[PDB]
């Protein structure tokens, strides 16, 4: 129980310091925002 309670607290310092540890959720919200953004700048094009 001393090995378990120290290991749960090691998640708390690693996730609060490293912002790239949650990068698997970061590619979901950024590629969906990039898909909505490329619909915006395609309205400015003339299509010939």
């Amino acid at each position: 129980a001393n090995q378990f309670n120290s290991a749960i607290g090691k998640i708390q310092d690693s996730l609060s310091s490293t912002a790239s540890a949650l990068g698997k959720l970061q590619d979901v919200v950024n590629h969906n925002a990039q898909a909505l953004n490329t619909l915006v700048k395609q309205l400015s094009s003339k299509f010939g």
């Binding site: 915006v40 700048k41 309205l43 400015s44």
Partner: protein, 48 residues
């Protein structure tokens, strides 16, 4: 008020509110991130 717009050919549909940004004295109109009409100075009175 939702009205029609006719500002020297720059047509549109929306409301008119008071702008709080800084603008140029030679400026006819501005553009947003979608590169369309969003801010029009009056040709007689000068309200952007």
């Amino acid at each position: 008020k939702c009205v029609n717009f006719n500002f020297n050919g720059l047509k549109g549909t929306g409301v008119l509110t008071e702008s709080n940004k800084k603008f140029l004295p030679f400026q006819q109109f501005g553009r947003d991130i979608a590169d369309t009409t969003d801010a029009v100075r009056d040709p007689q009175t000068l309200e952007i």
